[PDB]
Amino acid sequence: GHSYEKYNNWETIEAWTKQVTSENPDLISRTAIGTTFLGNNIYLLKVGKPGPNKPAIFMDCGFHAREWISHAFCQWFVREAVLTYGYESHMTEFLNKLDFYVLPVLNIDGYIYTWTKNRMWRKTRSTNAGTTCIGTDPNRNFDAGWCTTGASTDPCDETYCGSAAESEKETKALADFIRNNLSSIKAYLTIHSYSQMILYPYSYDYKLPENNAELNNLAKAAVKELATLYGTKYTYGPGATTIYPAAGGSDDWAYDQGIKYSFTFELRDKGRYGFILPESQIQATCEETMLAIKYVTNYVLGHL
Ligand SMILES: CC(C)[C@H](NC(=O)OCc1ccccc1)P(=O)(O)C[C@H](C(=O)O)c1cccc(CN)c1
Ligand SMILES: [Zn+2]
Protein backbone atom coordinates (compact mmCIF):
# COMPACT_ATOMS: atom_id res chain seq x y z
CA GLY A 1 0.00 0.00 0.00
CA HIS A 2 3.02 2.28 -0.20
CA SER A 3 3.12 5.23 -2.60
CA TYR A 4 5.74 7.96 -2.91
CA GLU A 5 3.08 10.46 -4.07
CA LYS A 6 0.73 9.90 -1.14
CA TYR A 7 1.15 10.18 2.63
CA ASN A 8 1.70 6.72 4.11
CA ASN A 9 0.73 5.62 7.63
CA TRP A 10 3.41 4.25 9.96
CA GLU A 11 2.32 0.67 9.29
CA THR A 12 3.15 1.25 5.63
CA ILE A 13 6.33 3.25 6.16
CA GLU A 14 7.73 0.53 8.45
CA ALA A 15 6.97 -2.19 5.89
CA TRP A 16 8.57 0.08 3.29
CA THR A 17 11.80 0.47 5.27
CA LYS A 18 11.96 -3.34 5.32
CA GLN A 19 11.12 -3.75 1.64
CA VAL A 20 13.25 -0.96 0.16
CA THR A 21 16.20 -2.40 2.08
CA SER A 22 15.34 -5.92 0.93
CA GLU A 23 15.28 -4.79 -2.69
CA ASN A 24 18.44 -2.68 -2.45
CA PRO A 25 20.87 -4.43 -0.06
CA ASP A 26 23.90 -3.12 -1.98
CA LEU A 27 22.81 0.48 -1.29
CA ILE A 28 20.79 0.34 1.93
CA SER A 29 21.18 -1.22 5.35
CA ARG A 30 18.50 -0.80 8.01
CA THR A 31 18.90 -0.71 11.79
CA ALA A 32 16.78 0.39 14.74
CA ILE A 33 18.46 2.96 16.97
CA GLY A 34 15.90 2.80 19.78
CA THR A 35 12.22 2.60 20.69
CA THR A 36 9.61 5.34 21.01
CA PHE A 37 7.65 5.97 24.18
CA LEU A 38 4.92 3.68 22.85
CA GLY A 39 7.27 0.99 21.65
CA ASN A 40 7.62 1.71 17.94
CA ASN A 41 10.95 1.09 16.21
CA ILE A 42 13.02 4.15 15.32
CA TYR A 43 14.49 2.98 12.02
CA LEU A 44 17.60 4.43 10.44
CA LEU A 45 18.58 3.72 6.84
CA LYS A 46 22.22 3.90 5.84
CA VAL A 47 22.11 4.84 2.17
CA GLY A 48 25.28 4.50 0.15
CA LYS A 49 27.67 2.05 -1.47
CA PRO A 50 29.24 0.15 1.46
CA GLY A 51 32.92 0.72 2.15
CA PRO A 52 35.57 1.23 4.88
CA ASN A 53 35.56 4.40 7.01
CA LYS A 54 33.24 6.58 4.92
CA PRO A 55 32.16 10.09 5.99
CA ALA A 56 28.41 10.61 6.40
CA ILE A 57 25.58 13.11 6.18
CA PHE A 58 22.69 12.77 8.63
CA MET A 59 19.11 13.62 7.70
CA ASP A 60 16.00 13.05 9.80
CA CYS A 61 12.34 13.58 9.04
CA GLY A 62 9.17 13.51 11.09
CA PHE A 63 10.29 15.44 14.17
CA HIS A 64 6.83 17.00 14.32
CA ALA A 65 3.86 14.71 13.78
CA ARG A 66 1.56 16.89 11.65
CA GLU A 67 4.32 17.83 9.20
CA TRP A 68 3.50 15.07 6.75
CA ILE A 69 5.40 16.41 3.75
CA SER A 70 8.55 15.96 5.84
CA HIS A 71 8.01 12.20 6.23
CA ALA A 72 7.22 12.06 2.50
CA PHE A 73 10.50 13.71 1.60
CA CYS A 74 12.77 11.20 3.33
CA GLN A 75 10.95 8.35 1.56
CA TRP A 76 11.32 10.17 -1.78
CA PHE A 77 15.01 10.83 -1.20
CA VAL A 78 15.72 7.15 -0.60
CA ARG A 79 14.05 6.11 -3.86
CA GLU A 80 15.93 8.83 -5.75
CA ALA A 81 19.22 7.56 -4.37
CA VAL A 82 18.63 3.91 -5.22
CA LEU A 83 17.08 4.41 -8.65
CA THR A 84 19.67 6.86 -9.97
CA TYR A 85 22.86 5.36 -8.51
CA GLY A 86 25.15 4.45 -11.39
CA TYR A 87 23.23 6.51 -13.96
CA GLU A 88 23.25 10.05 -12.61
CA SER A 89 26.87 11.10 -12.14
CA HIS A 90 26.39 13.28 -9.05
CA MET A 91 24.36 10.83 -6.95
CA THR A 92 26.75 8.06 -7.96
CA GLU A 93 29.72 10.01 -6.62
CA PHE A 94 27.75 10.94 -3.49
CA LEU A 95 26.88 7.35 -2.63
CA ASN A 96 30.35 6.15 -3.59
CA LYS A 97 32.17 8.63 -1.39
CA LEU A 98 29.75 9.09 1.51
CA ASP A 99 26.78 7.67 3.40
CA PHE A 100 23.42 9.25 4.04
CA TYR A 101 21.94 8.37 7.39
CA VAL A 102 18.24 8.78 6.74
CA LEU A 103 15.94 8.60 9.74
CA PRO A 104 12.52 8.48 8.01
CA VAL A 105 10.34 9.22 11.06
CA LEU A 106 11.64 10.30 14.47
CA ASN A 107 8.35 11.05 16.23
CA ILE A 108 6.47 7.93 15.19
CA ASP A 109 4.11 7.99 18.16
CA GLY A 110 2.85 11.43 17.24
CA TYR A 111 2.66 10.59 13.55
CA ILE A 112 0.37 7.63 14.30
CA TYR A 113 -1.76 9.99 16.39
CA THR A 114 -2.18 12.40 13.48
CA TRP A 115 -3.57 9.47 11.53
CA THR A 116 -5.78 7.96 14.23
CA LYS A 117 -7.04 10.91 16.27
CA ASN A 118 -5.77 14.44 15.65
CA ARG A 119 -4.20 15.51 12.36
CA MET A 120 -2.76 18.62 14.03
CA TRP A 121 -0.78 16.91 16.78
CA ARG A 122 2.81 18.18 17.02
CA LYS A 123 4.55 16.73 20.05
CA THR A 124 5.54 13.27 21.21
CA ARG A 125 3.00 11.12 23.03
CA SER A 126 4.78 10.51 26.33
CA THR A 127 2.92 11.03 29.60
CA ASN A 128 3.81 13.81 32.05
CA ALA A 129 3.87 13.53 35.84
CA GLY A 130 1.05 15.25 37.68
CA THR A 131 -0.98 16.25 34.64
CA THR A 132 -3.25 14.69 32.02
CA CYS A 133 -1.45 16.70 29.34
CA ILE A 134 0.54 14.68 26.82
CA GLY A 135 3.76 15.18 24.93
CA THR A 136 7.03 17.06 24.59
CA ASP A 137 8.16 19.22 21.67
CA PRO A 138 11.17 17.21 20.42
CA ASN A 139 12.70 20.26 18.78
CA ARG A 140 12.86 22.05 22.13
CA ASN A 141 14.23 18.96 23.84
CA PHE A 142 17.91 19.09 22.84
CA ASP A 143 20.81 20.47 24.90
CA ALA A 144 21.14 23.88 23.25
CA GLY A 145 20.20 26.86 25.37
CA TRP A 146 17.71 24.30 26.60
CA CYS A 147 14.35 25.86 27.51
CA THR A 148 15.85 29.36 27.65
CA THR A 149 13.71 30.92 24.93
CA GLY A 150 10.89 29.93 22.59
CA ALA A 151 10.26 27.00 24.93
CA SER A 152 7.50 26.41 27.48
CA THR A 153 8.01 24.61 30.79
CA ASP A 154 4.31 23.66 30.76
CA PRO A 155 3.46 20.07 29.69
CA CYS A 156 0.14 21.32 28.29
CA ASP A 157 1.78 23.60 25.73
CA GLU A 158 2.88 22.78 22.19
CA THR A 159 6.45 24.02 22.70
CA TYR A 160 6.96 22.15 25.99
CA CYS A 161 10.70 21.63 26.38
CA GLY A 162 10.36 18.54 28.55
CA SER A 163 11.44 17.70 32.10
CA ALA A 164 15.04 17.96 30.91
CA ALA A 165 17.13 17.96 27.75
CA GLU A 166 16.80 14.58 26.00
CA SER A 167 14.01 13.52 28.35
CA GLU A 168 12.35 11.91 25.34
CA LYS A 169 13.41 8.42 24.26
CA GLU A 170 13.33 9.58 20.65
CA THR A 171 15.50 12.67 21.06
CA LYS A 172 17.83 10.66 23.29
CA ALA A 173 18.10 7.92 20.65
CA LEU A 174 18.99 10.46 17.97
CA ALA A 175 21.54 12.32 20.09
CA ASP A 176 23.14 9.06 21.16
CA PHE A 177 23.58 7.93 17.56
CA ILE A 178 25.06 11.22 16.38
CA ARG A 179 27.24 11.31 19.48
CA ASN A 180 28.55 7.83 18.62
CA ASN A 181 29.34 8.82 15.02
CA LEU A 182 30.60 12.39 15.41
CA SER A 183 33.86 11.50 13.66
CA SER A 184 32.12 10.55 10.41
CA ILE A 185 29.06 12.83 10.30
CA LYS A 186 29.92 15.94 8.29
CA ALA A 187 26.52 17.65 8.03
CA TYR A 188 23.13 17.59 9.78
CA LEU A 189 19.84 18.17 7.97
CA THR A 190 16.46 18.13 9.73
CA ILE A 191 13.30 18.32 7.65
CA HIS A 192 10.21 20.32 8.73
CA SER A 193 7.26 22.21 7.25
CA TYR A 194 5.95 24.69 6.47
CA SER A 195 7.33 28.18 5.60
CA GLN A 196 9.72 27.52 2.73
CA MET A 197 12.95 28.32 4.58
CA ILE A 198 16.47 27.02 5.00
CA LEU A 199 17.52 27.79 8.57
CA TYR A 200 20.94 27.49 10.18
CA PRO A 201 22.12 28.38 13.72
CA TYR A 202 21.55 29.91 16.01
CA SER A 203 18.01 29.44 17.28
CA TYR A 204 18.54 29.43 21.04
CA ASP A 205 20.64 32.60 21.06
CA TYR A 206 21.11 35.63 18.80
CA LYS A 207 24.84 34.86 18.74
CA LEU A 208 26.20 33.82 15.35
CA PRO A 209 28.00 30.57 14.47
CA GLU A 210 31.74 30.79 13.81
CA ASN A 211 31.32 29.84 10.15
CA ASN A 212 28.27 32.09 9.73
CA ALA A 213 29.59 33.60 6.50
CA GLU A 214 29.88 30.36 4.54
CA LEU A 215 26.63 29.00 5.95
CA ASN A 216 24.76 32.00 4.60
CA ASN A 217 26.50 31.63 1.23
CA LEU A 218 25.66 27.93 1.25
CA ALA A 219 22.01 28.34 2.22
CA LYS A 220 21.77 31.10 -0.38
CA ALA A 221 23.00 28.99 -3.29
CA ALA A 222 20.80 26.09 -2.19
CA VAL A 223 17.60 28.15 -2.23
CA LYS A 224 18.65 29.52 -5.61
CA GLU A 225 19.12 25.96 -6.85
CA LEU A 226 15.79 24.87 -5.38
CA ALA A 227 14.04 27.69 -7.29
CA THR A 228 15.36 26.78 -10.74
CA LEU A 229 12.93 23.89 -11.00
CA TYR A 230 9.47 25.34 -10.31
CA GLY A 231 10.31 28.84 -9.11
CA THR A 232 9.49 28.04 -5.49
CA LYS A 233 11.07 30.79 -3.39
CA TYR A 234 12.65 30.08 -0.02
CA THR A 235 14.06 32.53 2.48
CA TYR A 236 17.09 31.64 4.57
CA GLY A 237 19.26 32.74 7.46
CA PRO A 238 19.91 32.16 11.19
CA GLY A 239 16.98 30.60 13.02
CA ALA A 240 16.49 33.26 15.69
CA THR A 241 15.98 36.06 13.16
CA THR A 242 14.74 34.25 10.05
CA ILE A 243 11.58 32.87 11.61
CA TYR A 244 11.56 33.09 15.40
CA PRO A 245 13.74 32.17 18.42
CA ALA A 246 13.36 28.61 19.67
CA ALA A 247 15.88 26.99 22.00
CA GLY A 248 16.60 23.28 22.31
CA GLY A 249 16.64 22.70 18.57
CA SER A 250 18.35 19.64 17.12
CA ASP A 251 20.22 21.67 14.50
CA ASP A 252 21.69 24.09 17.05
CA TRP A 253 22.75 21.14 19.16
CA ALA A 254 24.19 19.32 16.14
CA TYR A 255 26.21 22.40 15.26
CA ASP A 256 27.59 22.85 18.77
CA GLN A 257 28.64 19.21 18.60
CA GLY A 258 31.11 20.18 15.88
CA ILE A 259 28.96 19.47 12.83
CA LYS A 260 29.68 22.67 10.93
CA TYR A 261 27.02 22.20 8.27
CA SER A 262 23.70 22.10 10.09
CA PHE A 263 20.39 23.09 8.55
CA THR A 264 16.67 23.03 9.13
CA PHE A 265 14.49 22.89 6.05
CA GLU A 266 10.96 24.26 6.10
CA LEU A 267 9.16 22.88 3.05
CA ARG A 268 6.01 24.04 1.22
CA ASP A 269 3.94 25.94 1.54
CA LYS A 270 3.71 29.41 3.08
CA GLY A 271 0.34 28.93 4.74
CA ARG A 272 -2.19 28.37 1.97
CA TYR A 273 -2.54 24.75 3.07
CA GLY A 274 0.00 24.79 5.89
CA PHE A 275 0.55 21.33 7.41
CA ILE A 276 -2.25 19.92 5.28
CA LEU A 277 -0.24 20.12 2.06
CA PRO A 278 -2.20 18.35 -0.71
CA GLU A 279 -0.76 15.06 -1.91
CA SER A 280 -0.72 16.66 -5.37
CA GLN A 281 2.25 18.80 -4.32
CA ILE A 282 4.27 15.92 -2.91
CA GLN A 283 6.15 15.28 -6.16
CA ALA A 284 7.06 18.87 -6.99
CA THR A 285 7.94 19.64 -3.38
CA CYS A 286 10.31 16.67 -3.00
CA GLU A 287 11.78 17.27 -6.45
CA GLU A 288 12.85 20.85 -5.80
CA THR A 289 14.01 19.91 -2.29
CA MET A 290 16.16 17.11 -3.74
CA LEU A 291 18.12 19.76 -5.64
CA ALA A 292 18.89 21.76 -2.50
CA ILE A 293 19.89 18.62 -0.62
CA LYS A 294 22.18 17.49 -3.45
CA TYR A 295 23.64 20.98 -3.77
CA VAL A 296 24.53 20.96 -0.08
CA THR A 297 25.84 17.40 -0.36
CA ASN A 298 28.03 18.36 -3.31
CA TYR A 299 29.40 21.29 -1.32
CA VAL A 300 30.10 19.37 1.89
CA LEU A 301 31.77 16.65 -0.17
CA GLY A 302 34.18 19.05 -1.83
CA HIS A 303 34.98 20.32 1.66
CA LEU A 304 36.16 17.27 3.59
C1 LIG B 1 5.22 26.14 10.55
C2 LIG B 1 6.67 25.94 11.04
C3 LIG B 1 7.31 27.34 11.11
C4 LIG B 1 6.69 25.03 12.32
N1 LIG B 1 6.24 25.73 13.51
C5 LIG B 1 5.13 25.40 14.23
O1 LIG B 1 4.36 24.45 13.90
O2 LIG B 1 4.91 26.16 15.34
C6 LIG B 1 3.89 25.98 16.33
C7 LIG B 1 3.93 27.02 17.36
C8 LIG B 1 5.20 27.46 17.93
C9 LIG B 1 5.21 28.50 18.95
C10 LIG B 1 3.94 29.06 19.38
C11 LIG B 1 2.66 28.63 18.83
C12 LIG B 1 2.66 27.59 17.81
P1 LIG B 1 8.13 24.27 12.73
O3 LIG B 1 8.57 23.46 11.61
O4 LIG B 1 7.85 23.43 13.86
C13 LIG B 1 9.36 25.35 13.16
C14 LIG B 1 10.56 24.85 14.06
C15 LIG B 1 10.00 24.55 15.40
O5 LIG B 1 9.10 25.24 15.94
O6 LIG B 1 10.46 23.57 16.02
C16 LIG B 1 11.73 25.79 14.18
C17 LIG B 1 11.60 27.23 14.46
C18 LIG B 1 12.72 28.12 14.61
C19 LIG B 1 14.03 27.53 14.47
C20 LIG B 1 14.23 26.12 14.19
C21 LIG B 1 15.57 25.55 14.05
N2 LIG B 1 16.01 24.78 15.23
C22 LIG B 1 13.08 25.26 14.05
ZN1 LIG C 1 8.41 21.36 12.76
Coordinates of C-alpha atoms and ligand atoms in Angstrom, one line a residue:
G1 CA 0.0 0.0 0.0
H2 CA 3.0 2.3 -0.2
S3 CA 3.1 5.2 -2.6
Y4 CA 5.7 8.0 -2.9
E5 CA 3.1 10.5 -4.1
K6 CA 0.7 9.9 -1.1
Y7 CA 1.1 10.2 2.6
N8 CA 1.7 6.7 4.1
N9 CA 0.7 5.6 7.6
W10 CA 3.4 4.2 10.0
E11 CA 2.3 0.7 9.3
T12 CA 3.1 1.3 5.6
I13 CA 6.3 3.3 6.2
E14 CA 7.7 0.5 8.4
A15 CA 7.0 -2.2 5.9
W16 CA 8.6 0.1 3.3
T17 CA 11.8 0.5 5.3
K18 CA 12.0 -3.3 5.3
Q19 CA 11.1 -3.7 1.6
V20 CA 13.3 -1.0 0.2
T21 CA 16.2 -2.4 2.1
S22 CA 15.3 -5.9 0.9
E23 CA 15.3 -4.8 -2.7
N24 CA 18.4 -2.7 -2.5
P25 CA 20.9 -4.4 -0.1
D26 CA 23.9 -3.1 -2.0
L27 CA 22.8 0.5 -1.3
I28 CA 20.8 0.3 1.9
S29 CA 21.2 -1.2 5.3
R30 CA 18.5 -0.8 8.0
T31 CA 18.9 -0.7 11.8
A32 CA 16.8 0.4 14.7
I33 CA 18.5 3.0 17.0
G34 CA 15.9 2.8 19.8
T35 CA 12.2 2.6 20.7
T36 CA 9.6 5.3 21.0
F37 CA 7.7 6.0 24.2
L38 CA 4.9 3.7 22.9
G39 CA 7.3 1.0 21.6
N40 CA 7.6 1.7 17.9
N41 CA 11.0 1.1 16.2
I42 CA 13.0 4.2 15.3
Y43 CA 14.5 3.0 12.0
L44 CA 17.6 4.4 10.4
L45 CA 18.6 3.7 6.8
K46 CA 22.2 3.9 5.8
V47 CA 22.1 4.8 2.2
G48 CA 25.3 4.5 0.2
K49 CA 27.7 2.1 -1.5
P50 CA 29.2 0.2 1.5
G51 CA 32.9 0.7 2.2
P52 CA 35.6 1.2 4.9
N53 CA 35.6 4.4 7.0
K54 CA 33.2 6.6 4.9
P55 CA 32.2 10.1 6.0
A56 CA 28.4 10.6 6.4
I57 CA 25.6 13.1 6.2
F58 CA 22.7 12.8 8.6
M59 CA 19.1 13.6 7.7
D60 CA 16.0 13.0 9.8
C61 CA 12.3 13.6 9.0
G62 CA 9.2 13.5 11.1
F63 CA 10.3 15.4 14.2
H64 CA 6.8 17.0 14.3
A65 CA 3.9 14.7 13.8
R66 CA 1.6 16.9 11.6
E67 CA 4.3 17.8 9.2
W68 CA 3.5 15.1 6.8
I69 CA 5.4 16.4 3.7
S70 CA 8.6 16.0 5.8
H71 CA 8.0 12.2 6.2
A72 CA 7.2 12.1 2.5
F73 CA 10.5 13.7 1.6
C74 CA 12.8 11.2 3.3
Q75 CA 11.0 8.3 1.6
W76 CA 11.3 10.2 -1.8
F77 CA 15.0 10.8 -1.2
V78 CA 15.7 7.2 -0.6
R79 CA 14.1 6.1 -3.9
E80 CA 15.9 8.8 -5.7
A81 CA 19.2 7.6 -4.4
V82 CA 18.6 3.9 -5.2
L83 CA 17.1 4.4 -8.6
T84 CA 19.7 6.9 -10.0
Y85 CA 22.9 5.4 -8.5
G86 CA 25.1 4.4 -11.4
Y87 CA 23.2 6.5 -14.0
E88 CA 23.3 10.1 -12.6
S89 CA 26.9 11.1 -12.1
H90 CA 26.4 13.3 -9.0
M91 CA 24.4 10.8 -6.9
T92 CA 26.7 8.1 -8.0
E93 CA 29.7 10.0 -6.6
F94 CA 27.8 10.9 -3.5
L95 CA 26.9 7.3 -2.6
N96 CA 30.4 6.2 -3.6
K97 CA 32.2 8.6 -1.4
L98 CA 29.8 9.1 1.5
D99 CA 26.8 7.7 3.4
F100 CA 23.4 9.3 4.0
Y101 CA 21.9 8.4 7.4
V102 CA 18.2 8.8 6.7
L103 CA 15.9 8.6 9.7
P104 CA 12.5 8.5 8.0
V105 CA 10.3 9.2 11.1
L106 CA 11.6 10.3 14.5
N107 CA 8.4 11.1 16.2
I108 CA 6.5 7.9 15.2
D109 CA 4.1 8.0 18.2
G110 CA 2.8 11.4 17.2
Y111 CA 2.7 10.6 13.5
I112 CA 0.4 7.6 14.3
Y113 CA -1.8 10.0 16.4
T114 CA -2.2 12.4 13.5
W115 CA -3.6 9.5 11.5
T116 CA -5.8 8.0 14.2
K117 CA -7.0 10.9 16.3
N118 CA -5.8 14.4 15.7
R119 CA -4.2 15.5 12.4
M120 CA -2.8 18.6 14.0
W121 CA -0.8 16.9 16.8
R122 CA 2.8 18.2 17.0
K123 CA 4.6 16.7 20.0
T124 CA 5.5 13.3 21.2
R125 CA 3.0 11.1 23.0
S126 CA 4.8 10.5 26.3
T127 CA 2.9 11.0 29.6
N128 CA 3.8 13.8 32.1
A129 CA 3.9 13.5 35.8
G130 CA 1.0 15.3 37.7
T131 CA -1.0 16.3 34.6
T132 CA -3.2 14.7 32.0
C133 CA -1.4 16.7 29.3
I134 CA 0.5 14.7 26.8
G135 CA 3.8 15.2 24.9
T136 CA 7.0 17.1 24.6
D137 CA 8.2 19.2 21.7
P138 CA 11.2 17.2 20.4
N139 CA 12.7 20.3 18.8
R140 CA 12.9 22.1 22.1
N141 CA 14.2 19.0 23.8
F142 CA 17.9 19.1 22.8
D143 CA 20.8 20.5 24.9
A144 CA 21.1 23.9 23.3
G145 CA 20.2 26.9 25.4
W146 CA 17.7 24.3 26.6
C147 CA 14.4 25.9 27.5
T148 CA 15.9 29.4 27.7
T149 CA 13.7 30.9 24.9
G150 CA 10.9 29.9 22.6
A151 CA 10.3 27.0 24.9
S152 CA 7.5 26.4 27.5
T153 CA 8.0 24.6 30.8
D154 CA 4.3 23.7 30.8
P155 CA 3.5 20.1 29.7
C156 CA 0.1 21.3 28.3
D157 CA 1.8 23.6 25.7
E158 CA 2.9 22.8 22.2
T159 CA 6.4 24.0 22.7
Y160 CA 7.0 22.1 26.0
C161 CA 10.7 21.6 26.4
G162 CA 10.4 18.5 28.5
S163 CA 11.4 17.7 32.1
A164 CA 15.0 18.0 30.9
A165 CA 17.1 18.0 27.7
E166 CA 16.8 14.6 26.0
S167 CA 14.0 13.5 28.3
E168 CA 12.4 11.9 25.3
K169 CA 13.4 8.4 24.3
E170 CA 13.3 9.6 20.7
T171 CA 15.5 12.7 21.1
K172 CA 17.8 10.7 23.3
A173 CA 18.1 7.9 20.7
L174 CA 19.0 10.5 18.0
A175 CA 21.5 12.3 20.1
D176 CA 23.1 9.1 21.2
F177 CA 23.6 7.9 17.6
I178 CA 25.1 11.2 16.4
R179 CA 27.2 11.3 19.5
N180 CA 28.5 7.8 18.6
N181 CA 29.3 8.8 15.0
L182 CA 30.6 12.4 15.4
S183 CA 33.9 11.5 13.7
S184 CA 32.1 10.6 10.4
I185 CA 29.1 12.8 10.3
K186 CA 29.9 15.9 8.3
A187 CA 26.5 17.7 8.0
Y188 CA 23.1 17.6 9.8
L189 CA 19.8 18.2 8.0
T190 CA 16.5 18.1 9.7
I191 CA 13.3 18.3 7.7
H192 CA 10.2 20.3 8.7
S193 CA 7.3 22.2 7.3
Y194 CA 5.9 24.7 6.5
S195 CA 7.3 28.2 5.6
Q196 CA 9.7 27.5 2.7
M197 CA 13.0 28.3 4.6
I198 CA 16.5 27.0 5.0
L199 CA 17.5 27.8 8.6
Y200 CA 20.9 27.5 10.2
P201 CA 22.1 28.4 13.7
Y202 CA 21.5 29.9 16.0
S203 CA 18.0 29.4 17.3
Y204 CA 18.5 29.4 21.0
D205 CA 20.6 32.6 21.1
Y206 CA 21.1 35.6 18.8
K207 CA 24.8 34.9 18.7
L208 CA 26.2 33.8 15.3
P209 CA 28.0 30.6 14.5
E210 CA 31.7 30.8 13.8
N211 CA 31.3 29.8 10.1
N212 CA 28.3 32.1 9.7
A213 CA 29.6 33.6 6.5
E214 CA 29.9 30.4 4.5
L215 CA 26.6 29.0 6.0
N216 CA 24.8 32.0 4.6
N217 CA 26.5 31.6 1.2
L218 CA 25.7 27.9 1.2
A219 CA 22.0 28.3 2.2
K220 CA 21.8 31.1 -0.4
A221 CA 23.0 29.0 -3.3
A222 CA 20.8 26.1 -2.2
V223 CA 17.6 28.1 -2.2
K224 CA 18.7 29.5 -5.6
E225 CA 19.1 26.0 -6.8
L226 CA 15.8 24.9 -5.4
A227 CA 14.0 27.7 -7.3
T228 CA 15.4 26.8 -10.7
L229 CA 12.9 23.9 -11.0
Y230 CA 9.5 25.3 -10.3
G231 CA 10.3 28.8 -9.1
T232 CA 9.5 28.0 -5.5
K233 CA 11.1 30.8 -3.4
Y234 CA 12.7 30.1 0.0
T235 CA 14.1 32.5 2.5
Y236 CA 17.1 31.6 4.6
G237 CA 19.3 32.7 7.5
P238 CA 19.9 32.2 11.2
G239 CA 17.0 30.6 13.0
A240 CA 16.5 33.3 15.7
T241 CA 16.0 36.1 13.2
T242 CA 14.7 34.2 10.1
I243 CA 11.6 32.9 11.6
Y244 CA 11.6 33.1 15.4
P245 CA 13.7 32.2 18.4
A246 CA 13.4 28.6 19.7
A247 CA 15.9 27.0 22.0
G248 CA 16.6 23.3 22.3
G249 CA 16.6 22.7 18.6
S250 CA 18.4 19.6 17.1
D251 CA 20.2 21.7 14.5
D252 CA 21.7 24.1 17.0
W253 CA 22.8 21.1 19.2
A254 CA 24.2 19.3 16.1
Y255 CA 26.2 22.4 15.3
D256 CA 27.6 22.8 18.8
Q257 CA 28.6 19.2 18.6
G258 CA 31.1 20.2 15.9
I259 CA 29.0 19.5 12.8
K260 CA 29.7 22.7 10.9
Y261 CA 27.0 22.2 8.3
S262 CA 23.7 22.1 10.1
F263 CA 20.4 23.1 8.6
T264 CA 16.7 23.0 9.1
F265 CA 14.5 22.9 6.0
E266 CA 11.0 24.3 6.1
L267 CA 9.2 22.9 3.1
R268 CA 6.0 24.0 1.2
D269 CA 3.9 25.9 1.5
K270 CA 3.7 29.4 3.1
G271 CA 0.3 28.9 4.7
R272 CA -2.2 28.4 2.0
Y273 CA -2.5 24.8 3.1
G274 CA 0.0 24.8 5.9
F275 CA 0.5 21.3 7.4
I276 CA -2.2 19.9 5.3
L277 CA -0.2 20.1 2.1
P278 CA -2.2 18.4 -0.7
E279 CA -0.8 15.1 -1.9
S280 CA -0.7 16.7 -5.4
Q281 CA 2.3 18.8 -4.3
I282 CA 4.3 15.9 -2.9
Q283 CA 6.1 15.3 -6.2
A284 CA 7.1 18.9 -7.0
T285 CA 7.9 19.6 -3.4
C286 CA 10.3 16.7 -3.0
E287 CA 11.8 17.3 -6.5
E288 CA 12.8 20.8 -5.8
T289 CA 14.0 19.9 -2.3
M290 CA 16.2 17.1 -3.7
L291 CA 18.1 19.8 -5.6
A292 CA 18.9 21.8 -2.5
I293 CA 19.9 18.6 -0.6
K294 CA 22.2 17.5 -3.4
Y295 CA 23.6 21.0 -3.8
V296 CA 24.5 21.0 -0.1
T297 CA 25.8 17.4 -0.4
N298 CA 28.0 18.4 -3.3
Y299 CA 29.4 21.3 -1.3
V300 CA 30.1 19.4 1.9
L301 CA 31.8 16.6 -0.2
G302 CA 34.2 19.1 -1.8
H303 CA 35.0 20.3 1.7
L304 CA 36.2 17.3 3.6
Ligands
LIG1 C1 5.2 26.1 10.6 C2 6.7 25.9 11.0 C3 7.3 27.3 11.1 C4 6.7 25.0 12.3 N1 6.2 25.7 13.5 C5 5.1 25.4 14.2 O1 4.4 24.5 13.9 O2 4.9 26.2 15.3 C6 3.9 26.0 16.3 C7 3.9 27.0 17.4 C8 5.2 27.5 17.9 C9 5.2 28.5 19.0 C10 3.9 29.1 19.4 C11 2.7 28.6 18.8 C12 2.7 27.6 17.8 P1 8.1 24.3 12.7 O3 8.6 23.5 11.6 O4 7.9 23.4 13.9 C13 9.4 25.3 13.2 C14 10.6 24.9 14.1 C15 10.0 24.5 15.4 O5 9.1 25.2 15.9 O6 10.5 23.6 16.0 C16 11.7 25.8 14.2 C17 11.6 27.2 14.5 C18 12.7 28.1 14.6 C19 14.0 27.5 14.5 C20 14.2 26.1 14.2 C21 15.6 25.6 14.1 N2 16.0 24.8 15.2 C22 13.1 25.3 14.0
ZN2 ZN 8.4 21.4 12.8

